[PDB]
Amino acid sequence: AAKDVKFGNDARVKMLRGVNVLADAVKVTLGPKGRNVVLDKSFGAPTITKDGVSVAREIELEDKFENMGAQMVKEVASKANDAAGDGTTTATVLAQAIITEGLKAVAAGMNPMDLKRGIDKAVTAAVEELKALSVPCSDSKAIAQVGTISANSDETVGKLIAEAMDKVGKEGVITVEDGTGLQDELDVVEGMQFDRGYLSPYFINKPETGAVELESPFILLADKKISNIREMLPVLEAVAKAGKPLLIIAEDVEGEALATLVVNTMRGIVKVAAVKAPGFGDRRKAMLQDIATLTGGTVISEEIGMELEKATLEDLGQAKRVVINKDTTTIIDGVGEEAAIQGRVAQIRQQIEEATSDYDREKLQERVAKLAGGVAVIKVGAATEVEMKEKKARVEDALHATRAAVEEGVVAGGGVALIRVASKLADLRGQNEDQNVGIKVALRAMEAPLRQIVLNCGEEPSVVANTVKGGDGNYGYNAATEEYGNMIDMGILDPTKVTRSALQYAASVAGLMITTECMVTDLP
Amino acid sequence: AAKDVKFGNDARVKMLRGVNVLADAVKVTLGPKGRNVVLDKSFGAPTITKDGVSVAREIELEDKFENMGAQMVKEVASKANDAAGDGTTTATVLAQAIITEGLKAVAAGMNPMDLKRGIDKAVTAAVEELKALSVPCSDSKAIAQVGTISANSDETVGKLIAEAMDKVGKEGVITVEDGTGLQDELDVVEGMQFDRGYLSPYFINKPETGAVELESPFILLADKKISNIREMLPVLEAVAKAGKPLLIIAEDVEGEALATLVVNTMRGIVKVAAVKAPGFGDRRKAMLQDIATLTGGTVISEEIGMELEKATLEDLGQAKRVVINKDTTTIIDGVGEEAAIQGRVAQIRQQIEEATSDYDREKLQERVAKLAGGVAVIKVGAATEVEMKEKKARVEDALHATRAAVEEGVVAGGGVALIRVASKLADLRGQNEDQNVGIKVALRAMEAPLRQIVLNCGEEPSVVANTVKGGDGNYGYNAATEEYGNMIDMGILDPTKVTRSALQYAASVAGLMITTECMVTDLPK
Amino acid sequence: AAKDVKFGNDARVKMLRGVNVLADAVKVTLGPKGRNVVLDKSFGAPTITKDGVSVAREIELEDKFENMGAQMVKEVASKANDAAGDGTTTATVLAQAIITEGLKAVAAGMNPMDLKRGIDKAVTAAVEELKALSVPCSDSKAIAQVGTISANSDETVGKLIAEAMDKVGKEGVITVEDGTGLQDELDVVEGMQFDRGYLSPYFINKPETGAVELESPFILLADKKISNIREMLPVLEAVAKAGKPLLIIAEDVEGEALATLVVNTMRGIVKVAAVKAPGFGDRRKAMLQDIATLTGGTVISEEIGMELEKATLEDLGQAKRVVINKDTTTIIDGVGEEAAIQGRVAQIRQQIEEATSDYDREKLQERVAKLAGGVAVIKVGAATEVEMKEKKARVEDALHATRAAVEEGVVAGGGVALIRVASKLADLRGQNEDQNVGIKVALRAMEAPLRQIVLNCGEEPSVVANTVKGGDGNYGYNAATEEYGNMIDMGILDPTKVTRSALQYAASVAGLMITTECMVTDLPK
Numbered sequence A: 001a002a003k004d005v006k007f008g009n010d011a012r013v014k015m016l017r018g019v020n021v022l023a024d025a026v027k028v029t030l031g032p033k034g035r036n037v038v039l040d041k042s043f044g045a046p047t048i049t050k051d052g053v054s055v056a057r058e059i060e061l062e063d064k065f066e067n068m069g070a071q072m073v074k075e076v077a078s079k080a081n082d083a084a085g086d087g088t089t090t091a092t093v094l095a096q097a098i099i100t101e102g103l104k105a106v107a108a109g110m111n112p113m114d115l116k117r118g119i120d121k122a123v124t125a126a127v128e129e130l131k132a133l134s135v136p137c138s139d140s141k142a143i144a145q146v147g148t149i150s151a152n153s154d155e156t157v158g159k160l161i162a163e164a165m166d167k168v169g170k171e172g173v174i175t176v177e178d179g180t181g182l183q184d185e186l187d188v189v190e191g192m193q194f195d196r197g198y199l200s201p202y203f204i205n206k207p208e209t210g211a212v213e214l215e216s217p218f219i220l221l222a223d224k225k226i227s228n229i230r231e232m233l234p235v236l237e238a239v240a241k242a243g244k245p246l247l248i249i250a251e252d253v254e255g256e257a258l259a260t261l262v263v264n265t266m267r268g269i270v271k272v273a274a275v276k277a278p279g280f281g282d283r284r285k286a287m288l289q290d291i292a293t294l295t296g297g298t299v300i301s302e303e304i305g306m307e308l309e310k311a312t313l314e315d316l317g318q319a320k321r322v323v324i325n326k327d328t329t330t331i332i333d334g335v336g337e338e339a340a341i342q343g344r345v346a347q348i349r350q351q352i353e354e355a356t357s358d359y360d361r362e363k364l365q366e367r368v369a370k371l372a373g374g375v376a377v378i379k380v381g382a383a384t385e386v387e388m389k390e391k392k393a394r395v396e397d398a399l400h401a402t403r404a405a406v407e408e409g410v411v412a413g414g415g416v417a418l419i420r421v422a423s424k425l426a427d428l429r430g431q432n433e434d435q436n437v438g439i440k441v442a443l444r445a446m447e448a449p450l451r452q453i454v455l456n457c458g459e460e461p462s463v464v465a466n467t468v469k470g471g472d473g474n475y476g477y478n479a480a481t482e483e484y485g486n487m488i489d490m491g492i493l494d495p496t497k498v499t500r501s502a503l504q505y506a507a508s509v510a511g512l513m514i515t516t517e518c519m520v521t522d523l524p
Numbered sequence B, C: 001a002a003k004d005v006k007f008g009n010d011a012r013v014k015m016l017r018g019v020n021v022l023a024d025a026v027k028v029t030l031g032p033k034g035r036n037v038v039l040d041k042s043f044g045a046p047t048i049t050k051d052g053v054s055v056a057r058e059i060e061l062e063d064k065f066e067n068m069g070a071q072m073v074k075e076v077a078s079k080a081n082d083a084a085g086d087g088t089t090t091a092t093v094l095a096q097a098i099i100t101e102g103l104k105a106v107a108a109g110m111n112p113m114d115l116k117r118g119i120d121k122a123v124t125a126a127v128e129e130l131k132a133l134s135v136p137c138s139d140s141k142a143i144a145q146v147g148t149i150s151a152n153s154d155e156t157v158g159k160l161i162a163e164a165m166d167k168v169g170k171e172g173v174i175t176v177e178d179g180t181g182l183q184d185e186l187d188v189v190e191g192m193q194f195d196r197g198y199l200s201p202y203f204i205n206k207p208e209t210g211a212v213e214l215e216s217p218f219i220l221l222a223d224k225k226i227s228n229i230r231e232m233l234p235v236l237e238a239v240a241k242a243g244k245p246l247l248i249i250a251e252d253v254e255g256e257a258l259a260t261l262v263v264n265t266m267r268g269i270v271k272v273a274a275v276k277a278p279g280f281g282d283r284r285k286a287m288l289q290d291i292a293t294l295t296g297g298t299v300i301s302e303e304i305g306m307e308l309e310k311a312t313l314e315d316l317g318q319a320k321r322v323v324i325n326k327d328t329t330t331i332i333d334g335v336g337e338e339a340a341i342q343g344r345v346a347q348i349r350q351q352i353e354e355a356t357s358d359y360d361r362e363k364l365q366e367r368v369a370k371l372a373g374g375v376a377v378i379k380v381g382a383a384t385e386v387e388m389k390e391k392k393a394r395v396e397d398a399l400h401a402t403r404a405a406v407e408e409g410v411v412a413g414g415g416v417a418l419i420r421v422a423s424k425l426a427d428l429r430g431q432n433e434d435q436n437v438g439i440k441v442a443l444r445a446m447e448a449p450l451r452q453i454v455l456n457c458g459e460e461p462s463v464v465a466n467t468v469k470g471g472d473g474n475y476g477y478n479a480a481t482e483e484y485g486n487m488i489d490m491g492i493l494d495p496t497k498v499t500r501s502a503l504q505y506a507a508s509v510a511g512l513m514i515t516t517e518c519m520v521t522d523l524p525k
């Protein structure tokens, strides 16, 4: 179709205007004195929320160019939330700040490519300063504290997470499920987790978490690319009987097969979800068998001459529950016999001895860690179903935060960490004046979050920001109590991973937009 | 789709304008000299009403932003009516008053978050003053009085409610049905009520009450999530043959199953209604058995390996009637044998003795109270079908009012209780000046109801309000007779729960709107 | 959908404008020198009429608010014609007069609620004065006279009505049918009448009378609520084949069932009409059996386990004709055997002796009076089919008038009675000045009919009205001859019931509109 093309300043202003609508809408929720955004549903009453992620999802602009701007930031900003479980709003506010001053510079005559390099240099330096500022989170006491803070000052949640990580380890797999009663429960069952998400967002049945949950499902393991639904009929019919869901783990599911599964599942004829098999090549084949042993199913490999038509319900494995999000799949409580699993673990351990390559050994060590490690299951208990679902949510969110804290520690929150690191990089310079401007653009942008928080509180941002720079370390401003002091001590903190990711992603898109000269889109 | 986004004052003014249309439309009905609102019907002659709930339901604005404003207040204002069975109009009037003055403050430069905190502080204080002002409602004489006042001065209704609560108790289950003749009747039968509503508003067969009524139905008790319709075909066909309705009480009914039941029931092939099982976890399993013992049915537990395909009519329980609304389900007159029920009641109290914690005992005591407590059935009688339906409505309304009165008591009506509480909170302060303004915004807003009532009567609100503040206690202005005195004595009162709910919900939305900076909605296209 | 909301004066003026279009269109036909209204029918040549009811039915306005006004008056005004068989036009003219002056007062600053109270007080007083002015109508001579006057001075009709009422009594059921020839006939057959009308105005096949007539129809008796058409399939596919209509007498017919019957009947696939069963509760069940015994049908009671699917033609009762209007249903000449009916009559008479209550006896005595009383059938004869249909209409019209005359007597016509009563209530006062105005508004409005009649004649209304007030009793102005005198003697009169109903209904709607502050309707979109 005919396209509308824009260039230079004309394009960049449109791009900016779009980013402002997005940022301006989300940054009102930032801070403890965050404001409400009203999202219309036109079926029932409007939604009132302080969740910047919810707001972002709704933002789409009529102007095609302005929209492109908002959609570029949204995409990248969401990755920050996918990595650390927080920081999408922060990333958006940072992006705005960098782009605004960035474009001002470009208009002044600065070279866009140099500006970008200057920004990136300021960020790499800022990340290194974050590491130095970071406070470790290792002992269980600390883990419980971070969990409590992330759970809205609930000591219970902090304890649960601490106990869970003490059972499966810090790199261990932890899941959260509904409680059967009032008392909380913690068990370690046979399970595994691999880095593969849903092949279609239409499999999502739990929109709140944005994940797919399957209760007592069958698991199909095929070492083949499924493109047609013809070969699935015999298996789908067998699953349609006994009325249980189906998880398809194949090399890939595409074309008709995917489409049919997407439709049939949304119609509610047969609940089905599909994900790619973990890894690639030889490793993929081996891990499919791990899942088979674990779920007590058989892998349908066409390599040995097996066909999907002759796949019976006995060939399918099964587990108690399966959770699938955009990136990960978790199999919980496989029916696989203890003898079979311990048998394959010992088999792989034998392969570790025969390993010639270091790489080969590391990959095997990873697979045994999964099979032997198992999965921790936290059943959240409460007195009411409403209280139970609510607490469950806080546990899941606090879990992600605590995990991130264990990886890279914690730094002062309330946007202090960013303004702190920026203050330490005053003498940072680049190869030319344009790069120097890029650095200053980034350093000034790192004040955006704090300033915004202070603004929402109704205080003078410039004064607070000025005072915070005066201090050192994790000294900052507690926007909630209006008192200055050690942010970590006052309980206002963020996982260093969050702040890091937010900044890096923010700078990523900001850098791309600053170096854009042409935009192509459809006509109105 | 592309969205229209507004910010700051631009958004808040739009939001306000929408709230004014809603409020200005409903507040004309407030008071004993309230005016009529004419609601147009797509087909037929228009409706003339003084019911602010009926008016509110119809309010929808063309402007997307203004509409969002009206819909936010409607939603929250409705919850006051769901809690106490009255106060939707009051909550709307309050909301308007708080938002109006609240936004004026925001524009003046006040911090919205402080304004909200100041309002909330004034409300929490106002609620405490309401409790103090409240007059308890315990003795049957009082219950009859409140029931009479709520029934438009009909002593008959007051007596009926009093007698009913004297049989099943104050926390007992009371239901109302159509009369068979002129004589009113009251009977207590084997029954139970649990906090679970319909799973689809398309099961509603009685749109008037907005509930589902099933006559002599079968009850299916399955401890499983039904998602497919394949597994009930055998049961549905067996129920299609006895030509009787079916109540499905399962862990949950969703997907195709729900859809098919929604369609088939609206087509009239088989009358069916579905609700979730009460509670969750282990307690859910136990209560499903309580229903089973009561209805004389058997629970189809997949845990022990039972299937729904092998479910016969003998496995289904049955009662005389089932009433299901958005929140509650009531089973009336179960076929369960007296020996079976009394047997399980004794079993549970055995469990009360073996109970280690207090929580476990309280929860078991709750289940025995349901099984043994039974259900009171009030058949409203009259000389004409029209008069019978009319009186039935007054009994149902007066019942909800009386219940609310037994919970938190009664306070002066006519909007006096609010203006009274407000006058006692003149010295209330907050942490800063902004919060202090928030407090004054709330205190001035609590005069809105009275002022509006007086206005509808054609008298000077500022004079009446000024006189009422001069007095103490439940001293106020009877808008009907235009005389001052004790409102309780004059018979102008409201359940303390009503006034409280109305205020708290009104302040809830008002606080949210005052602290709104952004609104997102679709384009006029 | 988005709504358009108006308030206060803006709403009331819209309402008024709509009432004016209605009133101004119908009031041109009022009086003996009434004018013609030309109604377009879109299929053929236009209709020319002086029937204000026909005109009103056609009135629908483009402006949604104006329309609401006209539709409110139409609704209430029609009830006057349903009660006394006349007075819709009068009620409309009165309504206009009250609303016009009423709103003028509201705009002046008068309190709407007081204005309404003042009006109502003036009306109750006016009705009492009407009773005093009323002249009884008891003896057959008087009945014949009133019938003659109502039949446009046809002594024949007067005699027919007199003879008919002499057979079945004054409170007896009288029906009118087409004649077989020139000679008129009068017979008493097995029949009954109960106070239940059509469930949908789309069943009407005789738009002239606004009723439903079914010839040699089958009658379905079910003591259940029919909501689905599925259960009707077997019975319906047995009526169309028979080539006969179907009358459904059930507890109620609603939802799909009603809709399907409304459509199918208008398509002409199967002629069907539905009405509710008489009474409620236990009494309803008993009366449904009375109809069964009378029509020679069997009741399908689900209580004993009968289903509507297993209903055969043998289960259905049948009569020679059925007449259904908005309020009443009349079964004429049932096929029920004399032995069966006389058997149940004696059975009920036995229950009268065992009756403990007075109320119970009175209700049973009503049941027997219907079954034993029967129905009088008047076959109107003439020399031509045209003359026959024409006379039949006058007989039906004169019948309704005469019945109303027997109930409350007759008063001066030509709008004299109203202006007479008004002149006697000059000293009537209220509690305050606002109510006093309301009274004067009503008294001045009672001159509207006369003045309009005089206007249509081309005379000065103010002069005539002034002269009529000068006299006393039933002294008035015969607009036809332009002579003053005793209106009753000159043969210009109206059943007291008509004038009463017209005034009361007129004041009812007027009172509601005067107390309206808000109107809600859809947008022009």
Ligand SMILES: [Mg+2]
Pocket: C084, C085, C086, C397, C400
């Ligand atoms: Mg007539």
